Design a protein around this ligand. Structure first.
Ligand SMILES: Nc1ncnc2c1ncn2[C@@H]1O[C@H](COP(=O)(O)OP(=O)(O)O)[C@@H](O)[C@H]1O
Lengths: 71, 67
């Protein structure tokens, strides 16, 4: 279901998109998803083309101590 | 791939990339038999559906990378 969620990622095709159960035009264009990914190799190439990648380094024990104490 | 849009705009013909390479079987290029449950046509004719004309341009990406 790649194009099934490309059609909802892009707000232009949702202007009059009708689901197979509701069959009435509806504008799902005001949503702007921000997503998190665990693995990127398995993500399709067109999907990886339209998103910008941001990488989280990790954590240290010194930071973890403060995280646990304060949060 | 940008050459695809350049050529299509020169021709003023509709362009639609089709994501291949990651496929594994034959029943997805051409729709599997209607008898098997959940019969759906092949991705190709899906792209043919997406366009409203009989002469679009289709790009077949990275073909050089069980059915
Ligand atoms: N000389 C050039 N003029 C215009 N765009 C260029 C040129 N060289 C590279 N590009 C850009 O390179 C990018 C390549 O993306 P794409 O065609 O999808 O790559 P690929 O064919 O490897 O999948 C496009 O954004 C294209 O416009």
């Amino acid at each position: 279901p790649a194009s099934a969620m490309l059609e909802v990622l892009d707000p232009e095709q949702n202007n009059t998109f009708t689901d197979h159960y509701l069959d009435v035009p509806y504008d799902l264009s005001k949503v702007f998803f921000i997503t998190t990914a665990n693995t990127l190799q398995t993500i399709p190439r067109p999907l990886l083309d339209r998103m910008e990648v941001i990488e989280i380094p990790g954590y240290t024990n010194m930071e973890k101590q403060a995280i646990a104490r304060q949060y | 791939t940008s050459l695809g849009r350049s050529i299509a705009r020169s021709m003023n013909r509709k362009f639609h990339r089709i994501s291949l390479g990651g496929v594994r079987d034959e029943a997805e290029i051409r729709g599997h038999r209607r008898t098997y449950i959940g019969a759906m046509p092949g991705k190709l004719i899906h792209a043919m559906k997406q366009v409203g004309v009989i002469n679009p341009v289709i790009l077949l990406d990275e073909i050089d990378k069980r059915g």
